[PDB]
């Protein structure tokens, strides 16, 4: 401002950004096989 007049200017700007990603991995597996031969019928137990 100078004689005679008045000027005023205001400017405001803000930004915000956020990102989140999560991934988890877990797995289990197992196999078991077997064979046999055995030479009364009570032994079949």
């Amino acid at each position: 401002r100078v004689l005679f007049a008045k000027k005023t200017k205001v400017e405001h700007r803000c930004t915000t950004n956020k990102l989140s990603e999560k991934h988890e991995g877990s797995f289990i597996q197992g196999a078991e096989k077997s064979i046999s031969l055995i030479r009364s019928e009570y032994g079949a137990a």
Binding site: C14, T15, N17, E24, Q29, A31, K33, L37, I38, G43
Partner: protein, 49 residues
């Protein structure tokens, strides 16, 4: 024929050539176990003023 894995006595025949009392038995086991899993998570956010 004497007592083999059974009662007191059995009776054979002329046509039958043999009766045997030998024990043999076979067994097998093939076990398989599987278990898969999946877990995916995604998130996004955007704000502007």
């Amino acid at each position: 024929v004497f007592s083999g894995d059974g009662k007191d006595f059995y009776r054979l025949s002329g046509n039958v050539l043999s009766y045997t009392f030998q024990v043999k038995i076979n067994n097998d086991f093939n076990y398989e176990f599987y278990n898969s899993t999946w877990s995916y998570v995604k998130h996004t956010s955007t704000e502007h003023t």
